[PDB]
Amino acid sequence: DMYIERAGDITWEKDAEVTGNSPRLDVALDESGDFSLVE
Amino acid sequence: GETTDGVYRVMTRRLLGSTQVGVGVMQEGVFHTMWHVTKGAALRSGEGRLDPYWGDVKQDLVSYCGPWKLDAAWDGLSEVQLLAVPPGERAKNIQTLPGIFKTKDGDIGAVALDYPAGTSGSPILDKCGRVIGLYGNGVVIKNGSYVSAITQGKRE
Numbered sequence: 091d092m093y094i095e096r097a098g099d100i101t102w103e104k105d106a107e108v109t110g111n112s113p114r115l116d117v118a119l120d121e122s123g124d125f126s127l128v129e
Numbered sequence: 130g131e132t133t134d135g136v137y138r139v140m141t142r143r144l145l146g147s148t149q150v151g152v153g154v155m156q157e158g159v160f161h162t163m164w165h166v167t168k169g170a171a172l173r174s175g176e177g178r179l180d181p182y183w184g185d186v187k188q189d190l191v192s193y194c195g196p197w198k199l200d201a202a203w204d205g206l207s208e209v210q211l212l213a214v215p216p217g218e219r220a221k222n223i224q225t226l227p228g229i230f231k232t233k234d235g236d237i238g239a240v241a242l243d244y245p246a247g248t249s250g251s252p253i254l255d256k257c258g259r260v261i262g263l264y265g266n267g268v269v270i271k272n273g274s275y276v277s278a279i280t281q282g283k284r285e
């Protein structure tokens with residue numbers, strides 16, 4: 091059986107680590123909820 | 130059991146030791162996570178039981194104890210924070226500028242951050258701390274890294 095455990099508050103943190111790029115991708119979403127790249 | 134607002138880990142004892150299968154948000158007495166984390170199964174919180182209330186495999190979302198409550202949206206301009214809760218590791222805020230998933234049914238924000246299996250369901254927040262969606266459903270690009278959609282439900 092699955093169980094839950096608290097891990098923290100949901101708040102914005104000032105001066106958090108800023109990372110990651112912002113790609114624009116053409117995608118398709120199928121009936122099973124899976125995304126795939128369209129090229 | 131615990132119904133205080135916040136981010137929670139989703140654990141199981143079925144496999145070796147205690148394994149983290151995902152993450153979720155408790156808000157207004159409703160537990161929100163991604164469908165692929167629980168597959169719609171019931172959850173435990175101390176001695177109390179959480180039963181699924183709404184779910185959808187295509188959206189890859191599920192709510193427990195009540196209807197989906199999260200309705201904040203990415204504005205299409207500002208940076209956001211992923212409140213990543215990785216297995217065996219402390220909750221950590223990561224700030225990023227989302228990219229875009231362009232689909233035949235419209236555009237969706239996307240975050241290019243990579244975390245282990247078990248981090249799915251971690252919330253994405255705006256500068257006011259509002260949950261604009263959950264992380265964990267997206268695509269694998271050329272390099273092998275992940276780009277997740279900012280997945281949001283609809284508050285009925």
Ligand SMILES: C[C@H]1CC2(CN1C(=O)Nc1ccc3c(c1)CNC3)CC(F)(F)C2
Nearest residue numbers: 123124165189244245246248249265266
């Ligand atoms: C490849 C990893 C990377 C990931 C998310 N992943 C998934 O496999 N997601 C996933 C699995 C099954 C289904 C769906 C999505 C929707 N349909 C069923 C862990 C992470 F959250 F850290 C980021």
